[PDB]
Paper text:
At the core of [name]-1 replication initiation is the OBP, a 94 kDa protein encoded by the [name] gene. As an essential component of the viral replication machinery, OBP integrates multiple critical functions: origin recognition, DNA binding, and ATP-dependent helicase activity. OBP consists of two major functional domains: an N-terminal helicase-like domain (residues 1–535) and a C-terminal origin-binding domain (residues 536–851). The structures reveal a head-to-tail dimer architecture, with DNA binding on one side.
The second structure captures OBP bound to the complete [name] recognition site, in complex with a non-hydrolyzable ATP analog (ATPγS). In our OBP + [name] + ATPγS complex, we observe both the ATP analog and a coordinated Mg2+ ion, capturing the nucleotide-bound state. ATPγS binding induces subtle closure of the pocket's lower half and a shift of the motif I P-loop, suggesting conformational changes that may couple ATP hydrolysis to DNA unwinding. Within this pocket, we observe a seemingly unusual nucleotide interaction pattern: K87 of motif I contacts the α- and β-phosphates of ATPγS, while backbone amides from S85, G86, K87, and T88 form hydrogen bonds with the α-phosphate. This arrangement differs from other helicases, where the equivalent conserved lysine typically contacts the β- and γ-phosphates. Therefore, our structure potentially represents a non-catalytic state before ATP adopts a position in its pocket that is consistent with turnover. Within motif Ia, our structure shows that R112 reorients to interact with the γ-phosphate of ATPγS. Motif VI exhibits an unexpected arrangement where R389 directly contacts the γ-phosphate of ATPγS, while R387, despite its conservation, remains too distant for ATP interaction. The catalytic Mg2+ ion is coordinated by D174 and E175 within motif II, underscoring their critical role in helicase activity, as evidenced by the loss of function in E175A mutants. Each monomer threads its C-terminal end through its partner molecule, bringing it into close proximity with the ATP-binding pocket in the other monomer.
Numbering used by the authors:
A (entry chain A): 18 to 139, 145 to 433, 451 to 843
B (entry chain B): 16 to 134, 145 to 434, 451 to 843
Write the structure that this text describes.
DNA sequence: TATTGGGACGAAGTGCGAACGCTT
DNA sequence: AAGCGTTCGCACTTCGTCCCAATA
């Protein structure tokens, strides 16, 4: 059955997909803002207003397809809008492609230059072209006046702000809100400019001054393209091909009438066998490596491009007969020649993957396809949840003046925030990442982005039109016909020498969720696989979890003091599930068991956190920032020396071998290590203290007390002596001082006296992995875990059994 | 011996100096240093008395930091009879404590038309500040005179978990402070940050400060003595069971530093004295009662679960043990008690040293002027909180406080606006210092000393150097480490009494109440929950029910797998307390399941059908009636997967952990086996047979047959709004008679026989009704902060385009 | 059969003259 | 605008772990 809800749910899903990308702009703008005029340009390349006459409005905002001549229309308009040779202008881009292109492509203008590296002068800057992420180092030189302003891919330009790669955001936001107050004329343009951008520009220069252009033409490469969403993956034809041949008789009994739906690997076979040239988008690497291993049976001259392969220019694609690629082509350049006969795409919505806008910008990287084909498969395994674009959202968004909620719905404890610019467009980054949780919604977003570029999207069977029934009956197929095939992509998965294990590991959800919690977000997958290989062994798990608790008790200093708070930290970091790679190269989950009595662990991190602070510990910076002699080690331990001796002894043979950290192997290592320690009083304190220090750091956390070459103490080498830091090394050792004021002479004094600073020194070095945990210095955008640590350090423990 | 040197002198010197600055021990030193224009006076003889209210020298706003026991309210009577002229003059008096709401309206005889808290004409009104959200919007906008009695307590109850309309009560208080011309404020621990806040809003020249230095004999001129030893070796010999008393031992031969609590108690109680005993914990109050019962029969106990007696009931008894209940009751005035003992214990979920201080002053005058205090540091082992790094940062910055221990700045919770933000530091350092014994001890030593009482530590008759304090401190830390063993082999042993007070003191149980439950709960209903929670089925039903409510609070969790791992790992893993059948408390682990999809796919179904109902586990089960007509409409929209999961969960190949455990999967398979196949049976009757197993086995919530005469509300003794007219046209026929709601009910009394059908409601069992749920209201814990994060932050792409 | 002592190479620092930034 | 306070390119080497080949 249809189930009643599906008419309302489909029609809501399609309507919000249309609204978020501005598919309704020709109806909404003349209804809600009568003082704004709107242009529809229904044929031929786009054209802007008159570039010189006084009758044109000063703010014009353009929604116009990918591949419709927009750079040519901007060239035609900018050469006029620069009114005089003294007129000065600024151009902003999100994408790298225009920073290289526009400065090279403008021939109708002079003194134009790309992003600033070495031209710094003091100030001359006009006709500057910039990547928005780099704007912070250029801002002071702009002098805060321009006569003309241009934004292309403006929803990407205001969309870069949400990405973790932008830094010093608030000061760049405060500059963006300085240009945009219509000191210049403004032109703003995108393929998906929307109602909320037209509204926001009214909020900077009023309804009277805003003009809207809507383009509905795109080049033959797109307007003749005939996308088709297939019903079934066809892995049974893959298993007959990529594997060695099956038995001479007894094939699979299912799907004998083709299951009345053409299949991706079935259709791919025909074009490669017919001698066509072809190209293959793949949103995940694990399928890219599989379809490479398939294609070499039909045509040996395959190419494969993904984020761990080396740099290769798009001009090289003329030689190869199959080119396979992932979303790395977004930051590349268009393939302008005519070569490929058609195109295939495996799109897979998943929680840590690409947005459907990022897929659409990658499909468009080959311009003309000779037959006009394109076949897309949407793999619904891993995205089969209840929808996000509900009729409960539609009624709210359509009753309001087109304004969206800032969360999943209306509301309230929240972060500090940027300006009106950052907060106005936060709704779009939210729903671009929520909708990946559903295969409908994701399919209706992708279906919109294609249908806004004239691409005649079709399903299987339904050559022309679909009712709500026809659509809902289609997804009851691809939800099941994908899931029952998914097991094949575990058997076929690469264990050959070509296998990109660092890429195929990181693709999983379980690794994504570990990287979010424990590590720095900028780690290379190659260093995660060096870590996850250690965390398989029970000793390796133990050291990593002790070192994660040491870092947390430095970040949250209240954890060293209240026992109630340390239970909340221990339950969050040192319990649950981790991913690990076993001796075979397969990836397996491991459960970390809880412990009832955390007291023996807490007393030992409580006595190590104060001994780490005093050595300027930061595991992201390699280890201890300060060198110590053996006498300094004695001075670290001496205040609590008998208590270090007690707690190192107790963990050798605890009452119960509970949880992870007091497990049977973990207790044995410390009991073993105590056999090599000199007995108390048999050797000098400066020796016994070193012998105990090396055991408590060495077995629990794994960190070595290495020698170091530093010819003066503290953090600084001889290259970084300063007029301040010299004096501390004149006070100690009582050097004669009374020197000449000039630092050249203070250096020459110590380089004569350097023999005073002979003698042994040590430094703590962290073990190769573990140099990538999120330490106290390693700042990043807030995740849910950084919020929880900010909660523990700010809210006090309020009393329970109360007189009200 | 043990080394001390001078390394630890900064710890004491910082600790004592920060304690001083928090409670205002440096008014009339800091004021000339930082605000020279503000006038200051010292009163050192007899009662305090405020400046004349009638003269031209009646400047603006006055703040008073007079001791307890120095005549605050009588000096206010003198000042207010000079401040009130003609009856048209306008006044308001604010109190935090209940005691003045009863007292002042009864005690004022020099004035008329005065009244206590309200249950347009309003003047001479006296109010509890916890009523200000009801009272405030009914008041006139400005008054000629304003009294803030116990001001630091008045804007102190403002931080209470049960406070209402906080975002407007901050603004109401600010409006009164901004434009009332004459104001007086009177807390015995007023401080420099209240001086600064009023100097900010009214100007440095305007404010005047009164500092009291004398308090009446007996009331606040005792001889407080701290003792170094509890003396439990005497206790466990004294509480010897029947038979022989047993012989002495040579371990008693040491000097015991010359004094012990149980020794100095016994020597006076045997010597004929009548003795109160305060105890911060009930588990010690119930022991020291038994130690007196063998010496005399006239022994009371008054802990928080007993019926509260009026203090005139005391004075019959030889002993009257009590525990912080007297925070909200009247003070005992008669000269009955010879002396008094206290046991104070810093605890992370216990009462703070200012709440302990005003519990010791609830007995007023003593026949020999003595008071002996023991600080049990056994659960305050930790490193100091009042560090020199905090002292330097505060003292360098004009004495401004940082309001968190990190000294660093981003959750903008901001429930108030300005008063809430200015004073937030005080509640934070009042709770944090209970983590440590030295810092709790130096606060309590200050609060006694800044109220005239001479404080001594036993054996140090003249004065303490930092080293002398550090010797006494490490001593009493060792005493409480040893003596705590005796207090565990001794116990109440449950004479059919006080299990909830013995349970509730445990820090493991506080952690359970703040994570899962409503903070409204009494100890009595925690015990019967934790006693159920010991059974393996009980603890499985509880955690399925806790997860169902989180799936209604966070609506992304029912649709993102990455989000449901954050919720599952938090509400369904880790350690919980339980009560064993033996009558003792035991911790039990919830082990981490590797694969959660079998659970997520079930909650994803239950939290959609629970939203077709109005499910609300604190208010009932279902807020809505339903029947076998409706149950078909619950199951049939998504039936293709409901058919599998309840059967398949009973037949899984492997058992990852609790929610899929060997006991649970057999139990659900056995229960489900009574369901027919889809053949030779009614679809509705098959549907409801399945429905009772899904809800009944896994969540523990049964059906009950409807007593409602109509759908929704349907009692007939009295009518309720819209419940008749909202059904009167639902039968698709017109009555045309009348529109007045009440008398129309007779029309539905015809329809009752054709509205009829089999109708039911889900109901939550007696243990389940104290969960924190989506309909509830409370102040933010770390967990409500987390659920705001999971719902408001989207999930970023990780293997990124680097 | 008997088990370890010698060689390679990552990686963090030495020390000369110098470069950048600044204000006589 | 010459003297001058942080910071460094380059050629050199010292520490510790990996590995193997020559003994037994
Ligand atoms: N590097 C280039 N060389 C030549 N023409 C280019 C180049 N980059 C862009 N174009 C122009 O781009 C037009 C395609 O339509 P447009 O809407 O202008 O594409 P666009 O929005 O610039 O897309 P891209 O992704 O930036 S090429 C072509 O007709 C070209 O004239
Ligand atoms: N509860 C009370 N019972 C009797 N007299 C009281 C009481 N409270 C105040 N007084 C009178 O006011 C003075 C004592 O008040 P203080 O101890 O200085 O401060 P207070 O806060 O008013 O006392 P409390 O807290 O109300 S017991 C004496 O003159 C008493 O006669
Ligand atoms: Mg463009």
């Amino acid at each position: 059955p249809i189930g009643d809800d599906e008419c309302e749910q489909y029609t809501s899903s399609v309507s919000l997909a249309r609204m978020l990308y501005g598919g309704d702009l020709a109806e909404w703008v003349p209804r809600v803002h009568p003082k704004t005029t709107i242009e529809r340009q229904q044929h031929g390349p786009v054209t802007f207003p008159n570039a010189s006459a006084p009758t044109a409005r000063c703010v014009t905002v353009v929604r116009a397809p990918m591949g419709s001549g927009k750079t040519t229309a901007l060239i035609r308009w900018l050469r006029e809008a620069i009114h005089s040779p003294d007129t000065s202008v600024l151009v902003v881009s999100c994408r790298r492609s225009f920073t290289q292109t526009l400065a090279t492509r403008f021939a109708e203008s002079g003194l134009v230059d790309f992003v600033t590296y070495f031209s710094s002068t003091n100030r001359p800057f006009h006709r500057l072209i910039v990547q928005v992420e780099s704007l912070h180092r250029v801002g002071p030189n702009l002098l805060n006046n321009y006569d003309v302003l241009v934004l292309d891919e403006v929803m990407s330009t205001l969309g870069q702000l949400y990405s973790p790669t932008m830094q010093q955001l608030g000061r760049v936001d405060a500059l963006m809100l300085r240009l945009l107050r219509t000191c210049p004329r403004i032109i703003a343009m995108d393929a998906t400019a929307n109602a909320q951008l037209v509204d926001f520009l009214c909020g900077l220069r009023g309804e009277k001054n805003v003009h809207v252009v809507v383009g509905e033409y795109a080049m033959p490469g797109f307007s003749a393209r005939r996308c088709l969403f297939l019903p079934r993956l066809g892995t049974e034809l893959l298993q007959a091909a990529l594997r060695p041949p099956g038995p001479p008789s007894g094939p699979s009994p299912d799907a004998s009438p083709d299951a009345r739906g053409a299949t991706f690997f079935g259709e791919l076979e025909a074009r490669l066998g017919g001698g066509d040239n072809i190209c293959i988008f793949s949103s995940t690497v694990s399928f890219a490596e599989i379809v490479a291993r398939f294609c070499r049976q039909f045509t040996d001259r395959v190419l494969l491009l993904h984020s761990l392969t080396p740099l290769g220019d798009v001009t090289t694609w003329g030689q190869y007969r199959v080119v396979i690629y992932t979303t790395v082509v977004t930051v590349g350049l268009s393939f302008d020649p005519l070569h490929f006969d058609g195109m295939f795409a495996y799109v897979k919505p998943m929680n840590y993957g690409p947005d459907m806008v990022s897929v659409y910008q990658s499909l468009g990287r080959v311009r003309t396809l000779r037959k006009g084909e394109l076949l897309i498969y949407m793999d619904g395994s891993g995205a089969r949840s209840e929808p996000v674009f509900t009729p409960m959202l539609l009624n709210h968004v359509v009753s309001s003046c087109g304004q969206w909620p800032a969360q999943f719905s209306q509301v309230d404890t929240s972060l500090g925030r940027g300006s009106r610019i950052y907060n106005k467009f936060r709704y779009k980054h939210y729903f671009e990442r929520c909708t990946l949780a559903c295969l409908s919604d994701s399919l209706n977003i992708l279906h919109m982005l294609l249908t806004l570029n004239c691409i005649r999207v079709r399903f299987w069977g339904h050559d022309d039109t679909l009712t709500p029934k026809d659509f809902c009956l289609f997804l009851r197929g691809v939800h099941f016909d994908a899931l029952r095939a998914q097991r094949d992509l575990r058997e076929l998965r690469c264990r050959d020498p070509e296998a990109s294990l660092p890429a195929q590991a990181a693709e999983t959800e379980e690794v994504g969720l570990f990287v979010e919690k424990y590590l720095r977000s900028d780690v290379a997958p190659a260093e995660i696989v060096a870590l996850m290989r250690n965390l398989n062994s029970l000793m390796g798990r133990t050291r990593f979890i002790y070192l994660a608790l040491l870092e947390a008790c430095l970040r949250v200093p209240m954890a060293t003091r209240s026992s109630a708070i340390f239970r909340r930290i221990y339950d969050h970091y040192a319990t649950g599930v981790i991913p690990t790679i076993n001796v075979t190269g397969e990836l397996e989950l491991v459960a970390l068991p809880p412990t009832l009595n955390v007291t023996p662990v807490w007393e030992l991190l409580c006595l190590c956190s104060t001994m780490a602070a005093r050595l300027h510990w930061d595991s992201a910076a390699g280890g201890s920032g300060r060198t110590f002699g053996p006498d300094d080690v004695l001075d670290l331990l001496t205040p609590h020396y008998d208590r270090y001796m007690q707690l190192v002894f107790e963990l050798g043979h605890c009452n119960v071998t509970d949880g992870l950290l007091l497990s049977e192997e973990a207790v044995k290592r410390v009991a073993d290590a105590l056999s090599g320690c000199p007995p108390r009083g048999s050797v000098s304190e400066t020796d016994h203290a070193v012998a105990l220090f090396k055991i408590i750091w060495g077995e629990l956390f794994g960190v070595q007390m290495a020698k170091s070459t530093q010819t003066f103490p503290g953090a600084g080498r001889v290259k970084n002596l300063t007029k301040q830091t010299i004096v501390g090394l004149l006070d100690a050792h009582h050097i004669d001082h009374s020197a000449c004021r000039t630092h050249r002479q203070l250096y020459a004094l110590l380089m004569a006296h350097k023999r005073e600073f002979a003698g042994a020194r040590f430094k703590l070095r962290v073990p190769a992995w573990g140099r990538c945990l999120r330490t106290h210095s390693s700042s990043a955008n807030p995740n849910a875990d950084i919020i929880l640590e900010a909660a523990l350090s700010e809210l006090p423990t309020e009393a329970w059994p109360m007189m009200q």
